[PDB]
Design a binder for this molecule. Structure first.
Ligand SMILES: N[C@@H](Cc1ccccc1)C(=O)N[C@@H](Cc1ccc(O)cc1)C(=O)O
Ligand SMILES: N[C@@H](Cc1ccccc1)C(=O)N[C@@H](Cc1ccc(O)cc1)C(=O)O
Lengths: 81, 81
């Protein structure tokens, strides 16, 4: 499954939702300017997925100790380095 | 009680948790550098609370359509402008 659009500082992050941009060395931007770019993903035909490890309920580790779904992010030890 | 520590671009944000910094016109920074000072609240012996309207489970509207508790943020219509 294709990875979602890249985003944020130095394009070092990937989109996890229409308005969620994360990276292991960035943390997560939720609804900030850095994640505006992620709104483009929804006008793209194919499905995308960011992150590798499944966590929480339908989410994916997006950053150090952080688990995100396209709807939000929460703290999750399972996502620690 | 008092609002939590200021954070983010030009002190416009407030802390909703150890690694959560949000502002109405900024969105939320979760685990990003912008939220680093937020972990300092932990050292303050007085209780704090940001946001004005409660939402979700122990959360508070932190930004346009976004609800955050000290350990996460999710899209929440109740928190819409
Ligand atoms: N490419 C978009 C839309 C789409 C969804 C499902 C099937 C085909 C196309 C997409 O994959 N959206 C994601 C969620 C998402 C992730 C990042 C982002 O910046 C915006 C949306 C999905 O629904 O799987
Ligand atoms: N000052 C801290 C610790 C404390 C909690 C309760 C009573 C007395 C002291 C604090 O108020 N923590 C918050 C949660 C929080 C908010 C913002 C932040 O950056 C980090 C933690 C609380 O429990 O109300």
């Amino acid at each position: 499954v294709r990875t979602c659009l890249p985003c944020g500082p130095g394009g070092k992050g990937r989109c996890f939702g229409p308005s969620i941009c994360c990276g292991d060395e960035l943390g997560c931007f939720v609804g900030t300017a850095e994640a505006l770019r992620c709104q483009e993903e929804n006008y793209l035909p194919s499905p995308c997925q960011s992150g590798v490890k499944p966590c929480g309920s339908g989410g994916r580790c997006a950053a150090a100790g952080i688990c995100c779904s396209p709807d939000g992010c929460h703290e999750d030890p399972a996502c620690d380095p």
